[model samples]
Target: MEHVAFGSEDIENTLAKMDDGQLDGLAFGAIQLDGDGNILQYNAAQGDITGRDPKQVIGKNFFKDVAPCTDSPEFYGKFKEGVASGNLNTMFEYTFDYQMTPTKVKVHMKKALSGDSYWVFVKRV
Candidate 1:
């Protein structure tokens, strides 16, 4: 398969077909979250970038327990809106500064094509 860019137009479609292993192969972070914000799949790149083990975050609430910094409207609010409307494909720049050095990154939130799940893609800027 070809390389998948963070800003790919068909990102959600591509990700929906990939398994955990394939997701881990990407250079950017990939996190899969359930409708209520519980984490479902966390890729190796995400673990490495965030310094959190996938085992520790799996099944945790992404907006509440895992990453509280995103609980606000800009981040979490968009997620909720997407979930409610079932069409979430938004992208923006964000700074991550919880439990680690401040890192500027591009964030992409997309509703999964297959199920009631969402995909968060992060790439350092």
Candidate 2:
């Protein structure tokens, strides 16, 4: 967070108004963890999207606390394989616990530079 900087006040202000209805109270953010699995930054829209304070959510392991769908061994293996080996391009949909409630979601994860991850812009479906 110290050496890495990408967030902008204007962008944060703009996203703060998007509201949760658009994404099922699940906030989305970007990460490039210095070539590691750690996160470097997050967007401001997270609060409205996930019903959480930005402070508590930032720096948290996304695939862990927020989205276990990507944290499980099977999914993790696939993601790792895609990242380690070569480029990955895919998108799909499924149902999972949204705020601990049974809900459906759509995800789009891809390879970027060397690290592959997702921009899970989720909403209730």
Candidate 3:
């Protein structure tokens, strides 16, 4: 799917009646990174998941945080390979400690713009 799949044409009319916090509540703390892994856009819902504000996240590299589970080379290396190898519709499940709790996450990474960059959409399960 196109990454721009986010947003609605009538977002203004819909958001006018609600506050930014309301919008935040409906979001998932997800992020899209450039091929070099520089953070670009991150969702509010995902900020709640990471315990960090989106502003603090956008410019920061996710790997620098040593993201709990992803800190492991076993996981990050494989993920990099998939993104570099033109793999799409891929699914993987991993465990992480995001909220001081053991969390099981399933992520789907697909070729977004085709090339080194890919989209990683993750959800807690």
The candidate that wins on lDDT is: 1
List model 1 lDDT by residue over 17-38, tens digit each: 7888888888789999989999
Where in model 2 is the C-alpha error above 4 Å?
1-37, 44-49, 113-119
Stretch of 10 with least lDDT, candidate 2: 1-10
TM-score per candidate: 0.94, 0.50, 0.63
Model 2 C-alpha lDDT versus the unseen true structure: 0.44
Better model by lDDT, 2 or 3? 3
Q: Write the per-residue lDDT of candidate 2 for residues 8-85, one digit (tens) a residue.
A: 223323433443343233344332222223443444443444455655655666666655756664455555665676
Please estimate how well model 1 matches the true structure, expressed as its whole-model Cα lDDT: 0.89
Worst 10 residues of 3 by lDDT: 1-10
lDDT for each candidate structure: 0.89, 0.44, 0.56
State residue 25's C-alpha deviation in candidate 3, in Å. 7.7
**Which clashing pairs does model 1 show?**
none
**Measured by TM-score, how close is model 2 to the native structure?**
0.50
Question: Is candidate 1 or 2 superior in lDDT?
Answer: 1
TM-score-best of 1 and 3: 1
The residue ranges of model 3 lying beyond 4 angstroms of the native Cα positions read: 1-27, 66-68, 114-116
RMSD of each: 1.4, 9.0, 7.2
Error of 2 at 92 (Å): 1.3
